[PDB]
């Protein structure tokens, strides 16, 4: 869908000087900004008041995601399922202010078997236990000599 979003200049939408009394310097500065944008309109410093379109996907359609692993430890799989439990807080898109990216996980397949419920993941208890033993004993030291350059 082509969804259209525009800007105004809201000082081109003031109208009443009682709204302008909040702006310091009086209405003369706002009128100077009016004269600035009309001088830009007759005439490359951009002002404001754009009109743009962006193509988005429609909402409510169902997608598939594939997260595969290459000889994983059970703690790594447990970390992936810990992320998949609370994926739904984050956003699978850009367009942060327009709420774009809200999603609900319909299912999660663990080598084909369905483990997803409404209250997170029901199943994969060995992976979760492995990752619970992995949060314990986790120090910043492993990250430090991972990031340290020779």
């Amino acid at each position: 869908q082509v969804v259209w979003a525009r800007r105004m200049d809201p000082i081109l939408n003031l109208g009443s000087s009682e709204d302008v009394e909040v702006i310091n310097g009086g209405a003369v500065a706002a009128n100077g900004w009016i004269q600035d944008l009309l001088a830009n309109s007759k005439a490359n410093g951009r002002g404001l008041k754009a009109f743009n379109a962006h193509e988005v996907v429609i909402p409510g359609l169902k997608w598939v995601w594939r997260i595969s692993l290459d000889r994983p430890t059970d703690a790594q799989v447990g970390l992936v399922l810990l992320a998949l439990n609370k994926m739904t807080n984050e956003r699978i898109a850009g367009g942060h202010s327009k709420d774009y990216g809200r999603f609900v996980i319909d299912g999660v397949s663990l080598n084909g078997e369905q483990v997803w419920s409404q209250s997170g993941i029901t199943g994969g208890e060995q992976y979760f236990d492995a990752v619970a033993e992995a949060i314990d004993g986790l120090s910043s030291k492993e990250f430090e000599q991972f990031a340290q350059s020779a």
Partner: protein, 234 residues
Amino acid sequence: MFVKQVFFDLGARIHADEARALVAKLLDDTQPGLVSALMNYMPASKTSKTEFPLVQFSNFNQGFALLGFGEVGAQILSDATPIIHDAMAKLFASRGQGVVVQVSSRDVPLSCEKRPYGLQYTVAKMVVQKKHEHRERLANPETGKVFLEGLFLRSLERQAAAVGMVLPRDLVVSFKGAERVSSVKLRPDSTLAHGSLRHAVFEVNARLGGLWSVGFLLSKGFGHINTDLQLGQG
């Protein structure tokens, strides 16, 4: 070509001829060349030009508006706008609390195409009589009809010639009726007045695609309306 329309908002309605008088008075002291171009004066003296007015005032619900026909009038309007807007800003900030002056702009293109069927257009505040002979023609409908047809056709022709575009010369016009007859005044408190038609309806086989001005007193905001609104307005 194209005609540029500039809308000036002060929060209160002032009439187009009164705005013309008001605009001249505020800038009379400084920048006389800008005033000469805006009112279509001769470059030597105060007398206005005989030819088609490129820059004319018009009507705006919260103020007045400027019409600049062609590139020359658009440029005159383009350079005139900040000085005039600052003039209203200082004038309305001198007295009272102060009001935000609000501007708007449009660049309406002009077009015309000949069609083999009649089309209806209504014009309001239409001044038609300016000598005694036109008053003599208006007494009998048969000899006033052809005068009004020639006035409308010559108005369309002179506006097409002044804007620099070619108009087909096989156009036929027809006049149905006017709602009211009223006088206009050149200056307030003057005994002289000019007769005028109100809500006149005309039928042209061709179609018009922009702001078109017809008849006399074009610089006072008299007798022009947007045809682009009137296609299918009902």
